[PDB]
Symmetry: C4
Subunit: 82 residues, 4 copies
Amino acid sequence: VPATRILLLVLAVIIYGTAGFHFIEGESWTVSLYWTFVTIATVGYGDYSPSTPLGMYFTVTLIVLGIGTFAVAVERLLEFLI
Amino acid sequence: VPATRILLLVLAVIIYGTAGFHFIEGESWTVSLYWTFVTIATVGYGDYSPSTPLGMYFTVTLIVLGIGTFAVAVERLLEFLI
Amino acid sequence: VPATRILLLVLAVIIYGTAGFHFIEGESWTVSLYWTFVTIATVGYGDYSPSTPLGMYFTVTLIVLGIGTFAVAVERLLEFLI
Amino acid sequence: VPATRILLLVLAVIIYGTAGFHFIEGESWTVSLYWTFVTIATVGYGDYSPSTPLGMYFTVTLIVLGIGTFAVAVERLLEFLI
Ligand SMILES: [K+]
Ligand SMILES: [K+]
Ligand SMILES: [K+]
Ligand SMILES: [K+]
Ligand SMILES: [K+]
């Protein structure tokens, strides 16, 4: 896949994760964007995490859709900077 | 391995992790499924974690059996959506 | 590398991580083995973590030496079960 | 990329992460170095994490720049020890 397409895909993942956490769990936009990156990178500090059943289901969907997309994006970003 | 077989394997991993956490650590089915995904993806928030010796041994077995299975499943899922 | 050699290497990693956490941070042998797996798999729940400067340095050494060894071991284990 | 160049790149990542966490979040140099390794390895215990908006943005930049660099460095280090 072209690197620019990979960029769009991970951006869509970031929008999906941020808006979902914000509306479902009620955290701020900034915290929700930070949590999304922390999650799809598998860092998972746990300073923020879903506490409702709907948020838990949503988080599973983000894990399944975003961790692989983020991994490919980082590998592509390595090629353009190194 | 065919992608559909990989699907069955990760599903078996999910059943194993969910039922084990539920019966060993006593959390609800929903929390146990959420914890299983969070674990085999290596996100590991830590909002839920085993607190008994048996749960700790079980969690090691799930880590050894599920992290690799989940990684292959996500890589295959990328091929079918991208 | 032969799969059996990879097995020995990750076992040495596990011994090193368990004994170090036990003696440096003072946790039990069982907790220390559980923490070692949780760490080298990058799950990192955070229910246990080093709280002394020496434990923090030791944990960095285990992260650098064990995460790659564990990743190869899981990939090899996939070949023998799938 | 030559293994020695990869070494320099991850070292630059470590300097960037340590100084940033120290100055932005105000933790000690030692804690900040430990947190940097824990983050770029994706272990993410969560015993330390950014609590300010600026620290959250900085942490995203470190996640995007350091996780891929660290992964290549560990894979190269495996070749020189195994
Ligand atoms: K983690
Ligand atoms: K954590
Ligand atoms: K974690
Ligand atoms: K890989
Ligand atoms: K991880």
